[PDB]
């Protein structure tokens, strides 16, 4: 049964909805994006009307199987009437294709949902500089002041430099990046731009790469593997067994490998600095963890929300446990009293 924070009240909506079988009363499915935790339950056998961006429709058509007829692409920054209301899609600085969702309601209330986000200062210079909020459903994963990690332009250019010094000093070297999921993907486009490489992988990464809109793409990659000195391999491989393993079958092309695994925030972000990083070394292999993160910083997330002001927060991540959600709305009434709303 479908949660209260994924319905819209007033409407026949819900957001990221999938995994609950027919919804009552539900005549429309938004999708903020194409991560598994939010699309759980869709397939060829879906037979409602989805509602996404374009990106989002690609990767549902040839990666779900989804008919054409039930999917429901909306441009971004537009003012587009569904089902009688008023909605706008607008870029959550999340993944490939993610969405936030502005609908404004037939009673003149104005709810926002950031489906998952990273809160940057460009939003307040989109559609949403205009006009009040009533109500924000808010992507609250890092809603806690130790949760700190660097820009994501200060982790490529860490991830750039260390790649580039690597093969520079040793021209038979290989570089590997983990991935499990959409998103993240300038970790490896930028390393293989440096190395002057295009990026190889599997037919069935290469086909979720293709629904992205990334221009220049056929440039970019390939599953030609024995031509590129970047390779990207499911994040579980992102290990000196699997990585052991993986050397072996390249036909001694290459005697060392330099290994990327992208994580979210971790502990040792509460001590070092993105610059002192090193990395887990076993013979010829290193594996370097690094902190690239698509969710708001407690001090992103704070600054996003005290601009908005909106009139009352609904948690969306973090809601399982009494503690998770007393701590949020501590958090919640500081920032109200701070900023004066
Ligand atoms: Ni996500």
Same mark, same amino acid.
């Given at each position: 049964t479908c949660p209260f924070y994924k319905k819209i009240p007033g409407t026949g909506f819900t957001v990221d909805?999938?995994?609950?079988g027919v919804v009552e009363g539900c005549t429309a499915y938004f999708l903020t994006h194409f991560h598994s935790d939010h699309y759980a339950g869709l397939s060829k056998h879906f037979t409602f009307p989805v509602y996404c961006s374009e990106i989002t429709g690609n990767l549902l058509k040839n990666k779900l199987h989804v008919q054409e007829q039930y999917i429901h692409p909306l441009p971004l920054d537009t003012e587009c009437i569904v089902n009688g209301v008023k909605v706008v899609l607008l870029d959550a &600085?999340?993944?490939?294709?993610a969405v936030m969702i502005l609908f404004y309601l037939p009673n003149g209330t104005v709810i926002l949902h950031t489906g998952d986000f990273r809160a940057d200062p460009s939003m307040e210079r989109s559609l949403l500089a205009d006009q009040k909020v009533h109500m924000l459903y808010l992507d609250t994963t890092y809603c806690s002041p130790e949760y700190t990690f660097p820009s994501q332009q200060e982790v490529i250019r860490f991830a750039i430099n260390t790649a580039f010094e690597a093969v520079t000093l040793n021209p038979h070297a290989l570089v590997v990046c983990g991935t499990y999921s959409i998103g993240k993907e300038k970790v490896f486009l930028a390393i293989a731009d440096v190395l002057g490489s295009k990026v190889g992988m599997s037919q069935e990464k290469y086909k979720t790469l293709q629904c992205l809109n990334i221009p220049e793409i056929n440039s970019l990659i390939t599953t030609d593997m024995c031509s590129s000195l970047v390779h990207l391999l499911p994040?579980?491989?992102? &290990?000196f067994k699997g990585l052991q393993s993986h050397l072996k079958?390249?036909?001694?092309?290459?005697?060392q490998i330099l290994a990327f695994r992208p994580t979210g925030w971790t502990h040792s972000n509460k001590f070092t600095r993105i610059a002192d990083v090193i990395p887990q070394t076993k013979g010829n292999i290193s594996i370097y963890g690094i902190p690239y993160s698509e969710h708001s910083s407690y001090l992103e997330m704070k600054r996003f929300v005290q601009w908005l002001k909106p009139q009352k927060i609904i948690p969306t991540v973090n809601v399982g446990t009494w503690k998770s959600r007393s701590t949020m709305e501590k958090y919640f009434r500081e920032w109200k009293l701070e900023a004066g709303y």
């Open positions: 909805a999938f995994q609950y &600085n999340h993944c490939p294709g994040m579980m491989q992102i &290990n079958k390249c036909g001694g092309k290459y005697n």
